[PDB]
């Protein structure tokens, strides 16, 4: 089951109970199509069905030409930079080496599926999905009409259309994507071809189950890379995700700005947890995905790509226990921009309501159910269908689950607004604590100068006379030199 916790003290919520499916690697395979080296049909003419065949033939021929030139070819900023098709392109380059095509063609002479070990020494599965060479050379040009050019059967025209269609659509996809497509369409790889290819990958049965039960997601994370067309062979490399980490727990963190609620428009200070995103257990630490929108959620299964992740210690969850914990320095940003908004979570809605904004929650049959006050608040999806914050209506998720409201005082109340640093994009609890402490120390030091001069006494008169100090005034020394005094001790 999916459960959720809202933390009133930090304007954030955790949704948990999900299971991982992390793309950690790539699997590359070579897909081939056998082509005929037909150049031109010679015809006297006048027959409508031959004329129809020659049109389809010309579609085939410029599909070849077109393929022939394609052959001659908050915390997101902290992420690294990968090269997503480096693995597939590396295989593609090997295919351009002289000799490799021949070895693929021989390996696939008897069967349509063969494992071929290339110059690289790598071993990649190769598959033959369409044989237009055999169809054109043996089914169309033996029944070449006559040399009077008149085929007899309309069924042959329709059948050639059917078989040529896949090559045409593959050519179209490559021609508008500069030889690289994603997601991988059913023309590039039919649903049966992908399932049989999953059945051959070097993965556990659990990993085959998972991919086979989510082939639409597999397609979305895969690439088809046009490679070579030569020696009557069209070859392209499909690059499929390897889910090396599956079935580990994931949780999603949702965050929204937490501001003081003073009536004066510009007197308020704001704090927002910046560590929103997906979190999944992975090899003793946590993979953290800051662009949660780039992860793909299928029921309680979370498909994320480790290329879009940071590797964090397991203690990062302690920010959901106590944002001031000493084991992990929780990430926050600060500002004075107290605009209202909502964050729709897995099982509810965080509402940050500030200023004069009107903020409510409703359901479809009974209308308004809750009127929020200024501050950061939350409602679960039980009996709530929508929330409205200002001029924005939001539908909440209706997925079944249980939500817990964790009361706590908003931590923004703990800060002295005179020394609060309110311009930090990428800061943390301890970084803010330190700048607050430096500021308070710059303030006493000023108070110490001002308290010191406050106790200094002004200059005595400048009149040629000596002065001594008595009862907070300068008095003439001579006043005491006209009389005889006594030792008082």
């Amino acid at each position, epitope marked *: 089951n999916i*459960t959720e916790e809202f933390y009133q003290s930090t304007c954030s919520a955790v949704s948990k109970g999900y299971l991982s499916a992390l793309r950690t690697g790539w699997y590359t395979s070579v897909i081939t199509i056998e082509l005929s080296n037909i150049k031109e049909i010679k015809c006297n003419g006048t027959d409508a069905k031959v004329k129809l065949i020659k049109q389809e033939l010309d579609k085939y021929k410029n599909a070849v030409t077109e393929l022939q030139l394609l052959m001659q070819s908050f915390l997101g900023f902290l992420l690294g930079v990968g090269s997503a098709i480096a693995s597939g392109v590396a295989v593609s380059k090997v295919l351009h080496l002289e000799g490799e095509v021949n070895k693929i063609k021989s390996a696939l002479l008897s069967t349509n599926k063969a494992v071929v070990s290339l110059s690289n020494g790598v071993s990649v599965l190769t598959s033959k999905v369409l044989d237009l060479k055999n169809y054109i050379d043996k089914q169309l040009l033996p029944i070449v009409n006559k040399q009077s050019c008149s085929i007899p059967n309309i069924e042959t025209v329709i059948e050639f259309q059917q078989k040529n269609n896949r090559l045409l659509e593959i050519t179209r996809e490559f021609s508008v994507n500069a030889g690289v497509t994603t997601p991988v369409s059913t023309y590039m790889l039919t649903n049966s071809e992908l399932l049989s290819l999953i059945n051959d990958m070097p993965i556990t049965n659990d990993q085959k189950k998972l991919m086979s039960n989510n082939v639409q997601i597999v397609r979305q994370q895969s690439y088809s890379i046009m490679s070579i067309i030569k020696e009557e062979v069209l070859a392209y490399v499909v690059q499929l995700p390897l889910y090396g980490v599956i079935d580990t727990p994931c949780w999603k963190l949702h965050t929204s700005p937490l501001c003081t609620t003073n009536t004066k428009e510009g007197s308020n200070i704001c704090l927002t947890r910046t560590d929103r995103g997906w979190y999944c257990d992975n090899a*003793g630490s946590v993979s953290f995905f800051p662009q949660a929108e780039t992860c793909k959620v299928q029921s309680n299964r979370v498909f994320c790509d480790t290329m879009n992740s940071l590797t964090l210690p397991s203690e990062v*969850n302690l920010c*959901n226990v106590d944002i001031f914990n000493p084991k992990y320095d929780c990430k926050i940003m600060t500002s004075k921009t107290d605009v209202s908004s909502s964050v729709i979570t897995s099982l509810g809605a965080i509402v940050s309501c500030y200023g004069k904004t009107k903020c409510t929650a409703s359901n479809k049959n009974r209308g308004i159910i809750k009127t929020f006050s200024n501050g950061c608040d939350y409602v679960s999806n039980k009996g709530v269908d929508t929330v409205s914050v200002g001029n924005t209506l939001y539908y909440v998720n209706k997925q079944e689950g249980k939500s*817990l409201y*964790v009361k706590g005082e908003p931590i923004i109340n703990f800060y002295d607004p005179l020394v609060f640093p309110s311009d930090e994009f990428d800061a943390s609890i301890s970084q803010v604590n330190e700048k607050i402490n430096q500021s308070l120390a710059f303030i006493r030091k000023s108070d110490e100068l001002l308290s010191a001069i406050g106790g200094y006494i002004p200059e005595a008169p400048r009149d040629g006379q000596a002065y001594v100090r008595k009862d907070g005034e300068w008095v003439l020394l001579s006043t005491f030199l006209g009389s005889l005094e006594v030792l008082f001790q």
Partner: nanobody
Amino acid sequence: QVQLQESGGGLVQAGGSLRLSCAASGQTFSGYVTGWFRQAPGKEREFVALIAWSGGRLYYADSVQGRFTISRDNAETTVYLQMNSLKPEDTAVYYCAAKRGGAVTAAEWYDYWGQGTQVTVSS
């Protein structure tokens, strides 16, 4: 995901003591909230104590505090529950449990459970 295994239960006379241990396997407890729960025969699973890191803030149910002490070793591989001044009403199967998220007492919100160890306190 962490696996939990309780040990240290048994039968004691009233006023005696016991020490329960919960060992993590698969991964350590670091970053997990670990809670102790107990369930008497015909009663719902009820909260006893929780702790979130070695030497961190403790929480105890009103029925047990001043009598029970929860702790975790520095290596975060084991949670301990020292129970003193035991009373017959403390008789139950005791369960350790772990969760991501915050330090809450609701059993339904803990993701991972041990199989439990029997504690019996006689008159």
